[PDB]
Amino acid sequence: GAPATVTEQGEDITSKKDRGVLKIVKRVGNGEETPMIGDKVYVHYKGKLSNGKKFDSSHDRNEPFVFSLGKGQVIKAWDIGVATMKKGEIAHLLIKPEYAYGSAGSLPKIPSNATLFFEIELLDFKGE
Numbered sequence: 001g002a003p004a005t006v007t008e009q010g011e012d013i014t015s016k017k018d019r020g021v022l023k024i025v026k027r028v029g030n031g032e033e034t035p036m037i038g039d040k041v042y043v044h045y046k047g048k049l050s051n052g053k054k055f056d057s058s059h060d061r062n063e064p065f066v067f068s069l070g071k072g073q074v075i076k077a078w079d080i081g082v083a084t085m086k087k088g089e090i091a092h093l094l095i096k097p098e099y100a101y102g103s104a105g106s107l108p109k110i111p112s113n114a115t116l117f118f119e120i121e122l123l124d125f126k127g128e
């Protein structure tokens with residue numbers, strides 16, 4: 001499936017090169033610019049435990065998911081991964097627990113030491 005394809009072909013976009021955030025571009029975006037820290041960012045996404053026990057999607061709430069890049073609001077893996085994307089890109093991320101919810105987890109929704117998978121579409125981003 002898509003997660004395994006990321007393991008196999010995904011680029012390691014971590015600074016430590018620890019495979020903690022792996023990325024495959026699934027549909028290329030438009031123009032050169034990528035978001036900067038502080039930018040207000042608009043996305044659609046589908047996320048699941050890589051074990052498929054829990055799923056989530058912006059679509060379930062009927063509207064884009066909006067957050068400020070680099071600004072405390074999402075797991076580390078998203079701050080890292082969404083920063084690499086272009087307006088209109090869709091990407092897959094596979095995420096080790098250190099870059100998501102760690103040994104602590106976020107019980108009962110997210111277990112300890114959980115690996116996460118997302119599909120993300122960057123819809124837009126605007127400066128603060």
Ligand SMILES: COc1cc2cc(c1OC)OC[C@@H](CO)OC/C=C/[C@H](O)[C@@H](C)OC(=O)[C@@H]1CCCCN1C(=O)[C@H]2C1CCCCC1
Binds near residue numbers: 045047048049073110
């Ligand atoms: C741990 O708590 C949650 C995790 C996840 C989604 C959650 C959530 O409950 C707050 O609810 C959906 C809405 C609130 O209706 O919240 C969206 C973004 C929330 C925040 O940005 C944080 C908590 O989420 C994240 O950083 C990441 C990346 C952005 C999208 C949501 N994501 C998640 O980890 C998902 C999670 C749900 C279970 C399957 C794996 C993804």
